[PDB]
């Protein structure tokens, strides 16, 4: 997490940076396979190390609240 920031920046900065990266790094259940293998390749880019699926998603999460709403309607 944000622990690499040393004793700098303050609570909120290391708080949000940690949490965001916590959820960002989580074992994500892949789209092209229900296997927990999705890794952030860059800003908004994701990939299932399993089936090699490279896809678009939120900047930090593979799926965004607004993204899930798309499939619905």
């Amino acid at each position: 997490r944000s622990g690499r920031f040393g004793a700098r920046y303050g609570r909120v900065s290391r708080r949000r940076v940690a949490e965001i990266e916590s959820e960002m790094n989580e074992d994500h259940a892949c789209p092209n396979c229900g296997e927990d293998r999705v890794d952030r390749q860059g800003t908004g880019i994701w990939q299932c190390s399993y089936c090699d699926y490279k896809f678009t998603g939120g900047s930090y999460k593979p799926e965004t609240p607004g993204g899930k709403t798309v499939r619905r309607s």
């Binding site: 940076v17 800003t43 309607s73």
Partner: protein, 237 residues
């Protein structure tokens, strides 16, 4: 006095220009004769240096290879279609007429065939609301009701890269690197921190603006600074 920073900008000198030569593609909708037979396969997902968000590499049946404004939920192998009779799913582009209401849409055109203008940045999306033979009301991300020609093409889905603004830059270095990829002079010196000669707010023995910050719309360049034609200011009230 000397010309203020906003005036230097206009000159379009190196410091103020965007690193165009490093930019990848001018993401624009395709030009199909008609029919709608045009389709293609997502070959890759790239980072767009101009928008800090993903752009999808696509290869069309007619050999054409072009990058595109990728909405969320698009990956390699997927088949995207463009045309009047295109399917109604994410990544596909068709006029607002052929688009069912209540469905989030991005990269909307202003004038049919202009390649798309509205809602193209990270996470945003418009909202097709009302249909007609003449008009197609679309709610832009700013919350404005934009009356549009039903012929205006658009893409289904929310622009990819959503939530970018959630995490703070934390340190100047991170801002530095971002700013370095845009047409913007950074860092920013406060007017009130300059000399009278340099900015209308400059001067004094302490830092504060001379006159009130709200400036008339009619103000000339060199003077139009601070709160431009503010209808109000502050939070209270």
């Amino acid at each position: 006095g000397r010309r203020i920073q906003g005036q230097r900008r206009g000159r379009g000198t190196s410091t103020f220009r965007a690193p165009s030569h490093r930019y990848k593609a001018d993401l624009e909708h395709r030009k199909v004769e008609d029919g709608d037979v045009i389709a293609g396969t997502v070959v890759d997902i790239e980072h767009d240096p101009a928008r800090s968000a993903p752009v999808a590499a696509v290869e069309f049946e007619d050999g054409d290879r072009r990058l595109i404004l990728a909405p969320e939920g698009v990956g390699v192998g997927d088949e995207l279609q463009v045309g009047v009779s295109a399917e109604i799913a994410p990544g596909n582009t068709l006029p607002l007429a052929e688009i069912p209401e209540g469905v989030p849409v991005c990269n909307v055109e202003s004038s049919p065939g202009d390649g798309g203008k509205f809602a193209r940045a990270s996470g945003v999306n418009a909202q097709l609301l009302t249909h007609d033979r003449n008009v197609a009301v679309v709610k832009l991300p700013s919350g404005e009701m934009k009356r549009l020609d039903p012929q205006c093409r658009a893409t289904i889905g929310v622009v990819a890269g959503g939530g970018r603004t959630d995490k703070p830059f934390v340190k100047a270095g991170n801002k530095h690197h971002k700013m370095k990829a845009r047409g913007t002079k950074w860092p920013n010196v406060r007017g009130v921190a300059m000399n009278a000669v340099d900015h209308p707010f400059g001067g004094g023995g302490r830092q504060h603006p001379g006159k009130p910050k709200s400036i008339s719309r009619n103000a000339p360049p060199g003077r139009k600074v601070g709160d431009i034609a503010s209808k109000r200011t502050g939070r209270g009230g």
